[PDB]
Amino acid sequence: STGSATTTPIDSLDDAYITPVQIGTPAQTLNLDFDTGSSDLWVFSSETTASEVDGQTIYTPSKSTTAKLLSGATWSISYGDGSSSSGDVYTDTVSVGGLTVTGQAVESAKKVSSSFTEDSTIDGLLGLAFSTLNTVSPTQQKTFFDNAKASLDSPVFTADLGYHAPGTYNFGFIDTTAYTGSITYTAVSTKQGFWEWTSTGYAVGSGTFKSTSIDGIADTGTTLLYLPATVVSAYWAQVSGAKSSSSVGGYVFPCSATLPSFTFGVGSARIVIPGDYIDFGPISTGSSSCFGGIQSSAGIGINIFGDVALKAAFVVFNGATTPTLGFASK
């Protein structure tokens, strides 16, 4: 089997991407944030504290003839941005782009933190990291991809995120029309539960490529590109007037600037992020200070190849017995 679904930016800045997902019988379609950095499929629901729902579409398990309470199971997750959610668990039928998994754990939110409530466009998350990170207790549950894998034509999914435009998540096949050149594959460590890999270096604009190993994670659920402070300083030093602002929480730059590109290495191959992809717009409405799309990881503990980086590539998440990642230009 295969599946193919369009993923759409939630706003004009590509702050996140939503993909429609069918849950239950009859189908209830919710727009979920596909997140290769976590491993829970959780949704706003009829059980979510009413004051914490503000415009999201909810899953109502009582209206699904295939929903079954997973007795005794609870979940609770905290994300790197400080947001969180928790609740109980149903199993139900879940379909993405024509690919159907029966008995998928659907984690029903009883509580969500403010950033989730405040984002009316995101009805939940669909985790695509390794199932060892799944938070369901006392019986850990498998991700949608893990459950589908054996049925897929090939044990892979691909992320093709658009810049200010829709893109595609495919399951079970590699669309050879969706990229240019060849796909370069690179080793993955699953030791932390992430799609963790080592970039071979970087360049800023037309500058020379610096060969240096940068371990990080391919994370569709993180908006920006978080890299070591040395790398980030070298990038922003090429932008007149750019500075790190403690009050704003990162590098800002004059909105009048034209940003340089940023290149990252994948083995001997190179992925070029155009400068425009690094502009996240005014820090507040009407400001001439703009927020940068490349930020320091120094306070995180891990480097994160988020959407800013991934949207410049066609990315293969190869879930073979030994997982690997593939990157192609497009």
Side-chain angles (χ1 to χ4, degrees), residues 42-62 64-67 69-109 112-141 143-148 150-190 192-242 244-287:
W42 74 261
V43 296
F44 279 79
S45 75
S46 57
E47 303 180 327
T48 307
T49 299
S51 65
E52 296 179 349
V53 183
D54 184 7
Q56 294 81 11
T57 294
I58 63 168
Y59 170 58
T60 303
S62 67
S64 174
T65 59
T66 43
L69 177 72
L70 185 62
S71 181
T74 59
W75 61 280
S76 180
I77 191 162
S78 309
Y79 297 100
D81 65 353
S83 64
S84 62
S85 53
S86 61
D88 55 19
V89 187
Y90 295 81
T91 58
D92 210 339
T93 302
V94 172
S95 299
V96 175
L99 170 65
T100 300
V101 167
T102 59
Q104 174 65 43
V106 178
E107 299 172 37
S108 170
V112 305
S113 65
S114 59
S115 69
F116 288 116
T117 301
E118 292 164 1
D119 184 3
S120 67
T121 69
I122 291 176
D123 301 325
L125 267 64
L126 191 148
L128 293 167
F130 292 89
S131 293
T132 55
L133 295 179
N134 176 266
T135 77
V136 176
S137 180
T139 307
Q140 188 172 59
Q141 300 295 303
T143 70
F144 174 83
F145 177 54
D146 220 330
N147 283 322
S151 301
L152 295 177
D153 291 356
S154 183
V156 306
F157 69 91
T158 65
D160 180 9
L161 302 180
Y163 167 67
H164 293 355
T168 305
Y169 281 103
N170 290 330
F171 291 83
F173 72 105
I174 284 163
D175 179 356
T176 62
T177 74
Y179 57 89
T180 65
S182 55
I183 307 178
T184 296
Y185 289 86
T186 197
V188 164
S189 172
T190 67
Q192 296 190 84
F194 300 122
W195 292 92
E196 188 173 0
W197 64 289
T198 302
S199 171
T200 49
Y202 69 97
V204 176
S206 57
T208 62
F209 186 83
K210 174 72 168 182
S211 295
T212 184
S213 296
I214 304 169
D215 179 289
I217 65 166
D219 183 2
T220 58
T222 290
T223 311
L224 306 187
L225 174 51
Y226 294 86
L227 292 173
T230 48
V231 179
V232 175
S233 182
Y235 178 80
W236 288 109
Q238 297 303 311
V239 178
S240 289
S244 183
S245 168
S246 56
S247 60
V248 173
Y251 279 89
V252 297
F253 68 92
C255 292
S256 60
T258 301
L259 295 178
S261 64
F262 184 88
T263 300
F264 63 95
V266 183
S268 56
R270 306 288 180 255
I271 299 297
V272 180
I273 305 170
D276 286 353
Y277 290 26
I278 298 162
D279 189 343
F280 279 74
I283 61 172
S284 297
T285 303
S287 178

Side-chain angles (χ1 to χ4, degrees), residues 7 17-21 23 30-34 41-44 94 121-126:
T7 193
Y17 297 77
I18 49 172
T19 309
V21 177
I23 309 176
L30 276 64
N31 295 328
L32 305 188
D33 185 352
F34 284 24
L41 193 176
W42 74 261
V43 296
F44 279 79
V94 172
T121 69
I122 291 176
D123 301 325
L125 267 64
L126 191 148

Side-chain angles (χ1 to χ4, degrees), residues 274-324:
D276 286 353
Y277 290 26
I278 298 162
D279 189 343
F280 279 74
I283 61 172
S284 297
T285 303
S287 178
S288 72
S289 185
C290 274
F291 198 67
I294 295 179
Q295 297 294 345
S296 180
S297 65
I300 295 176
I302 197 158
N303 299 307
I304 307 173
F305 293 88
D307 298 334
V308 162
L310 302 182
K311 73 177 65 179
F314 177 88
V315 186
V316 180
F317 294 80
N318 170 27
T321 305
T322 298
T324 66

